[PDB]
Amino acid sequence: DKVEELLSKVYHLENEVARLKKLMATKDDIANMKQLEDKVEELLSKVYHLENEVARLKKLV
Amino acid sequence: EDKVEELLSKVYHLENEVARLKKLMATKDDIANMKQLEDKVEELLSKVYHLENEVARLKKLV
Amino acid sequence: DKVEELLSKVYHLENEVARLKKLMATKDDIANMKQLEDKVEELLSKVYHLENEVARLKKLVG
């Protein structure tokens, strides 16, 4: 009776843990976001320089 | 006796699997983090459009 | 006795797994990250192009 209740609950948990393991691999690594943040950091910088260079040209012309 | 031994062993492996999941979870990106990066990509693309239009006029004027 | 112990550990696992599930729903998927990567691919191409144009505008004007 009580051992049965446990058997059923352990079975359910095993399935849940399996689904979580599956879902875990669909989630993105923090290392992927940091590397992307870096690239966006580079694009922040280059765009800043472009805005400066453009202003310069916009005044000469 | 037998079923209880089996249940001890299943619960032990689930505990170790669940413990592994909690450390895996910690190496994964939060959505709110991703949303702030999208906000910066939303900024940069607007600035790149604006610069494209400015450079279009400059090469025309020169 | 050993039934109590297993009843106790199961309960704790149920709560742990419920916590992991709602915590899983805060994490962003590789798909949306790949979409953001695509947009960063574009913007990096457009920046390089703009760099070329401006470098020419600079050396053409003065």
PDB file of C-alpha atoms in Angstrom:
ATOM      1  CA  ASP A   1       0.000   0.000   0.000  1.00  0.00           C
ATOM      2  CA  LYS A   2       2.581   2.575   1.128  1.00  0.00           C
ATOM      3  CA  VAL A   3       5.423   0.915  -0.806  1.00  0.00           C
ATOM      4  CA  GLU A   4       3.077   1.131  -3.820  1.00  0.00           C
ATOM      5  CA  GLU A   5       2.521   4.877  -3.274  1.00  0.00           C
ATOM      6  CA  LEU A   6       6.313   5.254  -3.274  1.00  0.00           C
ATOM      7  CA  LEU A   7       6.782   3.139  -6.422  1.00  0.00           C
ATOM      8  CA  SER A   8       4.319   5.385  -8.290  1.00  0.00           C
ATOM      9  CA  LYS A   9       5.871   8.636  -7.020  1.00  0.00           C
ATOM     10  CA  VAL A  10       9.424   7.474  -7.798  1.00  0.00           C
ATOM     11  CA  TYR A  11       8.279   6.542 -11.306  1.00  0.00           C
ATOM     12  CA  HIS A  12       6.754  10.015 -11.803  1.00  0.00           C
ATOM     13  CA  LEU A  13       9.916  11.731 -10.534  1.00  0.00           C
ATOM     14  CA  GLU A  14      12.136   9.708 -12.888  1.00  0.00           C
ATOM     15  CA  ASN A  15      10.021  10.927 -15.839  1.00  0.00           C
ATOM     16  CA  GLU A  16      10.144  14.532 -14.591  1.00  0.00           C
ATOM     17  CA  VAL A  17      13.927  14.388 -14.124  1.00  0.00           C
ATOM     18  CA  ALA A  18      14.237  12.968 -17.663  1.00  0.00           C
ATOM     19  CA  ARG A  19      12.146  15.821 -19.116  1.00  0.00           C
ATOM     20  CA  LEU A  20      14.211  18.376 -17.150  1.00  0.00           C
ATOM     21  CA  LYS A  21      17.474  16.865 -18.478  1.00  0.00           C
ATOM     22  CA  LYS A  22      16.048  17.212 -21.996  1.00  0.00           C
ATOM     23  CA  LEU A  23      14.970  20.825 -21.379  1.00  0.00           C
ATOM     24  CA  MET A  24      18.326  21.676 -19.742  1.00  0.00           C
ATOM     25  CA  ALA A  25      20.144  20.999 -23.038  1.00  0.00           C
ATOM     26  CA  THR A  26      17.793  23.406 -24.886  1.00  0.00           C
ATOM     27  CA  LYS A  27      18.895  26.261 -22.591  1.00  0.00           C
ATOM     28  CA  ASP A  28      21.735  28.628 -23.538  1.00  0.00           C
ATOM     29  CA  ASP A  29      25.149  28.625 -21.810  1.00  0.00           C
ATOM     30  CA  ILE A  30      26.183  31.750 -19.898  1.00  0.00           C
ATOM     31  CA  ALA A  31      29.501  31.574 -21.803  1.00  0.00           C
ATOM     32  CA  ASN A  32      27.528  32.047 -25.046  1.00  0.00           C
ATOM     33  CA  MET A  33      25.863  35.209 -23.741  1.00  0.00           C
ATOM     34  CA  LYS A  34      29.141  36.676 -22.415  1.00  0.00           C
ATOM     35  CA  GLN A  35      30.876  36.130 -25.766  1.00  0.00           C
ATOM     36  CA  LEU A  36      27.893  37.755 -27.520  1.00  0.00           C
ATOM     37  CA  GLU A  37      27.991  40.611 -24.996  1.00  0.00           C
ATOM     38  CA  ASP A  38      31.649  41.109 -25.994  1.00  0.00           C
ATOM     39  CA  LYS A  39      30.743  41.305 -29.697  1.00  0.00           C
ATOM     40  CA  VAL A  40      27.994  43.801 -28.890  1.00  0.00           C
ATOM     41  CA  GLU A  41      30.620  45.713 -26.820  1.00  0.00           C
ATOM     42  CA  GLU A  42      32.809  45.883 -29.960  1.00  0.00           C
ATOM     43  CA  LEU A  43      29.847  47.079 -32.018  1.00  0.00           C
ATOM     44  CA  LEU A  44      29.068  49.694 -29.326  1.00  0.00           C
ATOM     45  CA  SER A  45      32.654  50.996 -29.695  1.00  0.00           C
ATOM     46  CA  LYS A  46      32.846  50.967 -33.513  1.00  0.00           C
ATOM     47  CA  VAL A  47      29.475  52.691 -33.844  1.00  0.00           C
ATOM     48  CA  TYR A  48      30.677  55.390 -31.429  1.00  0.00           C
ATOM     49  CA  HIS A  49      33.771  56.036 -33.601  1.00  0.00           C
ATOM     50  CA  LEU A  50      31.631  56.117 -36.771  1.00  0.00           C
ATOM     51  CA  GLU A  51      29.288  58.735 -35.256  1.00  0.00           C
ATOM     52  CA  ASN A  52      32.341  60.917 -34.471  1.00  0.00           C
ATOM     53  CA  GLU A  53      33.937  60.480 -37.927  1.00  0.00           C
ATOM     54  CA  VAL A  54      30.589  61.177 -39.637  1.00  0.00           C
ATOM     55  CA  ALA A  55      30.047  64.429 -37.695  1.00  0.00           C
ATOM     56  CA  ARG A  56      33.549  65.544 -38.742  1.00  0.00           C
ATOM     57  CA  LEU A  57      32.758  64.900 -42.423  1.00  0.00           C
ATOM     58  CA  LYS A  58      29.284  66.445 -42.077  1.00  0.00           C
ATOM     59  CA  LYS A  59      30.897  69.745 -40.966  1.00  0.00           C
ATOM     60  CA  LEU A  60      33.732  69.837 -43.544  1.00  0.00           C
ATOM     61  CA  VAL A  61      31.132  69.366 -46.308  1.00  0.00           C
TER      62      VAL A  61
ATOM     63  CA  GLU B   1      12.632  -6.024   1.669  1.00  0.00           C
ATOM     64  CA  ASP B   2      13.248  -6.228  -2.101  1.00  0.00           C
ATOM     65  CA  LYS B   3      10.990  -3.347  -3.194  1.00  0.00           C
ATOM     66  CA  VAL B   4      12.357  -1.155  -0.380  1.00  0.00           C
ATOM     67  CA  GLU B   5      15.971  -1.870  -1.432  1.00  0.00           C
ATOM     68  CA  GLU B   6      15.017  -1.006  -5.021  1.00  0.00           C
ATOM     69  CA  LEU B   7      13.340   2.204  -3.832  1.00  0.00           C
ATOM     70  CA  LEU B   8      16.398   3.249  -1.780  1.00  0.00           C
ATOM     71  CA  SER B   9      18.599   2.849  -4.874  1.00  0.00           C
ATOM     72  CA  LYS B  10      16.201   4.733  -7.179  1.00  0.00           C
ATOM     73  CA  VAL B  11      15.914   7.627  -4.701  1.00  0.00           C
ATOM     74  CA  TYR B  12      19.717   7.810  -4.341  1.00  0.00           C
ATOM     75  CA  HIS B  13      20.207   8.132  -8.131  1.00  0.00           C
ATOM     76  CA  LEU B  14      17.403  10.712  -8.413  1.00  0.00           C
ATOM     77  CA  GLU B  15      19.062  12.753  -5.653  1.00  0.00           C
ATOM     78  CA  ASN B  16      22.362  12.728  -7.584  1.00  0.00           C
ATOM     79  CA  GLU B  17      20.551  13.523 -10.853  1.00  0.00           C
ATOM     80  CA  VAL B  18      18.622  16.362  -9.195  1.00  0.00           C
ATOM     81  CA  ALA B  19      21.880  17.671  -7.667  1.00  0.00           C
ATOM     82  CA  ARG B  20      23.503  17.578 -11.112  1.00  0.00           C
ATOM     83  CA  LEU B  21      20.512  19.486 -12.557  1.00  0.00           C
ATOM     84  CA  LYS B  22      20.877  22.287  -9.966  1.00  0.00           C
ATOM     85  CA  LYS B  23      24.503  22.922 -10.987  1.00  0.00           C
ATOM     86  CA  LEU B  24      23.652  22.693 -14.711  1.00  0.00           C
ATOM     87  CA  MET B  25      20.831  25.207 -14.118  1.00  0.00           C
ATOM     88  CA  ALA B  26      23.371  27.678 -12.662  1.00  0.00           C
ATOM     89  CA  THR B  27      25.378  27.700 -15.938  1.00  0.00           C
ATOM     90  CA  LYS B  28      22.334  28.782 -18.004  1.00  0.00           C
ATOM     91  CA  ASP B  29      21.268  32.280 -19.136  1.00  0.00           C
ATOM     92  CA  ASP B  30      18.332  34.098 -17.560  1.00  0.00           C
ATOM     93  CA  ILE B  31      15.693  35.515 -19.913  1.00  0.00           C
ATOM     94  CA  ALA B  32      15.955  39.017 -18.371  1.00  0.00           C
ATOM     95  CA  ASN B  33      19.670  39.006 -19.225  1.00  0.00           C
ATOM     96  CA  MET B  34      18.810  38.136 -22.830  1.00  0.00           C
ATOM     97  CA  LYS B  35      16.151  40.883 -22.894  1.00  0.00           C
ATOM     98  CA  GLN B  36      18.738  43.552 -21.973  1.00  0.00           C
ATOM     99  CA  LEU B  37      21.071  42.366 -24.751  1.00  0.00           C
ATOM    100  CA  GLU B  38      18.145  42.627 -27.196  1.00  0.00           C
ATOM    101  CA  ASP B  39      17.609  46.217 -25.980  1.00  0.00           C
ATOM    102  CA  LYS B  40      21.251  47.007 -26.931  1.00  0.00           C
ATOM    103  CA  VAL B  41      20.903  45.285 -30.295  1.00  0.00           C
ATOM    104  CA  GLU B  42      17.688  47.342 -30.737  1.00  0.00           C
ATOM    105  CA  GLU B  43      19.789  50.458 -30.013  1.00  0.00           C
ATOM    106  CA  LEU B  44      22.707  49.590 -32.292  1.00  0.00           C
ATOM    107  CA  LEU B  45      20.535  48.730 -35.319  1.00  0.00           C
ATOM    108  CA  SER B  46      18.736  52.083 -35.022  1.00  0.00           C
ATOM    109  CA  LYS B  47      22.104  53.867 -34.889  1.00  0.00           C
ATOM    110  CA  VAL B  48      23.385  51.891 -37.855  1.00  0.00           C
ATOM    111  CA  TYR B  49      20.295  52.832 -39.912  1.00  0.00           C
ATOM    112  CA  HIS B  50      20.799  56.510 -38.986  1.00  0.00           C
ATOM    113  CA  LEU B  51      24.495  56.350 -39.952  1.00  0.00           C
ATOM    114  CA  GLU B  52      23.664  54.591 -43.242  1.00  0.00           C
ATOM    115  CA  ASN B  53      21.336  57.490 -44.199  1.00  0.00           C
ATOM    116  CA  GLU B  54      23.972  60.066 -43.188  1.00  0.00           C
ATOM    117  CA  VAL B  55      26.726  58.353 -45.209  1.00  0.00           C
ATOM    118  CA  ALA B  56      24.359  58.087 -48.203  1.00  0.00           C
ATOM    119  CA  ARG B  57      24.037  61.896 -48.255  1.00  0.00           C
ATOM    120  CA  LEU B  58      27.759  62.496 -47.716  1.00  0.00           C
ATOM    121  CA  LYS B  59      28.849  60.394 -50.722  1.00  0.00           C
ATOM    122  CA  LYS B  60      26.162  62.152 -52.802  1.00  0.00           C
ATOM    123  CA  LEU B  61      27.400  65.614 -51.719  1.00  0.00           C
ATOM    124  CA  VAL B  62      31.048  64.673 -52.427  1.00  0.00           C
TER     125      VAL B  62
ATOM    126  CA  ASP C   1      10.748   3.215   9.265  1.00  0.00           C
ATOM    127  CA  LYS C   2      12.525   2.774   5.921  1.00  0.00           C
ATOM    128  CA  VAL C   3       9.123   3.612   4.428  1.00  0.00           C
ATOM    129  CA  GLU C   4       9.174   6.869   6.448  1.00  0.00           C
ATOM    130  CA  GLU C   5      12.693   7.658   5.211  1.00  0.00           C
ATOM    131  CA  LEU C   6      11.719   7.102   1.577  1.00  0.00           C
ATOM    132  CA  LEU C   7       8.432   9.013   2.073  1.00  0.00           C
ATOM    133  CA  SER C   8      10.570  11.890   3.421  1.00  0.00           C
ATOM    134  CA  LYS C   9      13.151  11.889   0.612  1.00  0.00           C
ATOM    135  CA  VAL C  10      10.464  11.607  -2.088  1.00  0.00           C
ATOM    136  CA  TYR C  11       8.644  14.653  -0.673  1.00  0.00           C
ATOM    137  CA  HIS C  12      11.891  16.678  -0.749  1.00  0.00           C
ATOM    138  CA  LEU C  13      12.571  15.580  -4.344  1.00  0.00           C
ATOM    139  CA  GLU C  14       9.039  16.554  -5.401  1.00  0.00           C
ATOM    140  CA  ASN C  15       9.624  20.073  -4.048  1.00  0.00           C
ATOM    141  CA  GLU C  16      13.109  20.231  -5.600  1.00  0.00           C
ATOM    142  CA  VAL C  17      11.775  19.196  -9.021  1.00  0.00           C
ATOM    143  CA  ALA C  18       8.900  21.727  -8.809  1.00  0.00           C
ATOM    144  CA  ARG C  19      11.484  24.425  -8.030  1.00  0.00           C
ATOM    145  CA  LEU C  20      13.691  23.349 -10.969  1.00  0.00           C
ATOM    146  CA  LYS C  21      10.723  23.486 -13.381  1.00  0.00           C
ATOM    147  CA  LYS C  22       9.768  27.099 -12.598  1.00  0.00           C
ATOM    148  CA  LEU C  23      13.481  27.985 -12.585  1.00  0.00           C
ATOM    149  CA  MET C  24      13.798  26.343 -16.034  1.00  0.00           C
ATOM    150  CA  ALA C  25      11.090  28.756 -17.285  1.00  0.00           C
ATOM    151  CA  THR C  26      13.323  31.755 -16.430  1.00  0.00           C
ATOM    152  CA  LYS C  27      16.142  30.520 -18.655  1.00  0.00           C
ATOM    153  CA  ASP C  28      16.362  31.611 -22.296  1.00  0.00           C
ATOM    154  CA  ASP C  29      16.481  29.068 -25.111  1.00  0.00           C
ATOM    155  CA  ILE C  30      19.350  28.491 -27.543  1.00  0.00           C
ATOM    156  CA  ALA C  31      16.913  29.345 -30.378  1.00  0.00           C
ATOM    157  CA  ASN C  32      16.392  32.964 -29.267  1.00  0.00           C
ATOM    158  CA  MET C  33      20.143  33.253 -28.681  1.00  0.00           C
ATOM    159  CA  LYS C  34      20.730  31.976 -32.245  1.00  0.00           C
ATOM    160  CA  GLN C  35      18.250  34.619 -33.499  1.00  0.00           C
ATOM    161  CA  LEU C  36      20.171  37.338 -31.620  1.00  0.00           C
ATOM    162  CA  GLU C  37      23.423  35.951 -33.050  1.00  0.00           C
ATOM    163  CA  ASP C  38      21.893  36.343 -36.566  1.00  0.00           C
ATOM    164  CA  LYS C  39      21.125  40.032 -35.907  1.00  0.00           C
ATOM    165  CA  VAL C  40      24.631  40.616 -34.541  1.00  0.00           C
ATOM    166  CA  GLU C  41      25.923  38.920 -37.739  1.00  0.00           C
ATOM    167  CA  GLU C  42      24.044  41.500 -39.842  1.00  0.00           C
ATOM    168  CA  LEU C  43      25.037  44.550 -37.804  1.00  0.00           C
ATOM    169  CA  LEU C  44      28.716  43.536 -37.848  1.00  0.00           C
ATOM    170  CA  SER C  45      28.530  43.309 -41.670  1.00  0.00           C
ATOM    171  CA  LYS C  46      26.871  46.745 -41.958  1.00  0.00           C
ATOM    172  CA  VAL C  47      29.421  48.311 -39.612  1.00  0.00           C
ATOM    173  CA  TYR C  48      32.360  46.980 -41.655  1.00  0.00           C
ATOM    174  CA  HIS C  49      30.693  48.373 -44.813  1.00  0.00           C
ATOM    175  CA  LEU C  50      30.145  51.769 -43.173  1.00  0.00           C
ATOM    176  CA  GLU C  51      33.801  51.782 -42.075  1.00  0.00           C
ATOM    177  CA  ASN C  52      34.842  51.305 -45.724  1.00  0.00           C
ATOM    178  CA  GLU C  53      32.539  54.091 -46.963  1.00  0.00           C
ATOM    179  CA  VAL C  54      33.652  56.619 -44.334  1.00  0.00           C
ATOM    180  CA  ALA C  55      37.367  55.808 -44.818  1.00  0.00           C
ATOM    181  CA  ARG C  56      36.856  56.696 -48.500  1.00  0.00           C
ATOM    182  CA  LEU C  57      34.851  59.841 -47.708  1.00  0.00           C
ATOM    183  CA  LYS C  58      37.714  60.912 -45.427  1.00  0.00           C
ATOM    184  CA  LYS C  59      40.417  60.367 -48.071  1.00  0.00           C
ATOM    185  CA  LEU C  60      38.259  61.825 -50.887  1.00  0.00           C
ATOM    186  CA  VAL C  61      37.446  65.082 -49.070  1.00  0.00           C
ATOM    187  CA  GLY C  62      40.894  65.512 -47.482  1.00  0.00           C
TER     188      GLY C  62
END
